[PDB]
Structures are given as structure tokens and as C-alpha cells.
Amino acid sequence: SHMVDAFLGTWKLVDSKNFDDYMKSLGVGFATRQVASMTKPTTIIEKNGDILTLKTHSTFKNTEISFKLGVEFDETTADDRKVKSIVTLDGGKLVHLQKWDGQETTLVRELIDGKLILTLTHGTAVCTRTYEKE
Ligand SMILES: CCCCCCCCCCCCCC(=O)O
Ligand code: NI
């Protein structure tokens, strides 16, 4: 299909709200939170055959996940959590669910009014990061 085509490309952060709150919720220490809060990472979304790849590149930490929609995969997050993940795409919302230690967090990407909105949710901690395509 072509459902993912609109997401493919290079995206740069233009705005962020409550990232600190989301990070601390995850157990990320103060020193790391300051450094992470200063960065403007670039996420690169790409497709190869049936497999999607999502790279996050910054002057601080770099990560990369590869997955097929609806298929579980192992992931080591930037804050070093070893999680089991699953990514699905429904109604144009790319939903990434991470599960570890009996708890979970979601990372949701949607294209709205010319921006990519990434909503990060861990319990009542909800962060919104805004990206724009290059
Ligand atoms: C670049 C973030 C450095 C600090 C690592 C904190 C890890 C929090 C989970 C990953 C958050 C990534 C959000 C995003 O892609 O913009
Ligand atoms: Ni296409």
C-alpha cells in the first residue's frame, strides 16, 4: 500500500511541550533531561520492502528502529529501556506502543495542518512535540 507515503522523509523538531514531564515520568535523571531538552532532533522515516525504519538523530543520542506494521519487535530506547514494541497505522495515525516491566508508553504520530505531531504518553504524563518536513 501507500498509506505510509506521507510520513516518509526527513523531519526536524520545531516545538516541544512538557518533554521534561514525560522524561522524568520515565525515570530519566535531571542532568540528562536538561541536555535532551536543548536538542532539536531529526527523525527520518523510510520504507524498504515491507519494513519501516525510523531514525532519530541528534547531537546527544541517536536511535533507530525497524519494524513491520502489526508485528512485535525488541527495542532499546534512548533512555536505555529494553522494551517490546508494536507499531500500527490506522486512520492516518502511526501508533507506537512500548511495553516493559508491566507498564507501557505510547508514541503517536499524525500529520495535521502541515506539521507532524508526536504525542508521547506515559500515564498522565503527556508531551507534545511538533516536527516539520524538510
Ligand atoms: C534525544 C532525547 C535524549 C534523551 C532521551 C530520553 C528518551 C525519551 C524517550 C524518547 C523520546 C524521543 C522523542 C522524540 O523523538 O522527539
Ligand atoms: Ni506510494
Nearest CA to 131 out of 2, 34, 8, 12 is that of 12
Whole-angstrom distance, CA of residue 65 vs CA of residue 3: 19
Nearest CA to 49 out of 1, 110, 95, 92 is that of 1
Q: Is 130 in the pocket of ligand 1 (CB under 6 A)?
A: no
**Tell me, what CATH number does 49's domain have?**
2.40.128.20
Annotated binding site for octadecanoate: 129-131
Overall domain count for the chain: 1
Whole-angstrom distance, CA of residue 9 vs CA of residue 11: 6
Domain of residue 68, residue span: 5-133
Contact (Cβ atoms closer than 8 angstroms) between residue 77 and residue 85 = no
Whole-angstrom distance, CA of residue 47 vs CA of residue 88: 14
Q: Is 125 in the pocket of ligand 1 (CB under 6 A)?
A: no
**Residue 89 to residues 109, 112, 114, Cα–Cα distance (Å):** 9, 15, 19
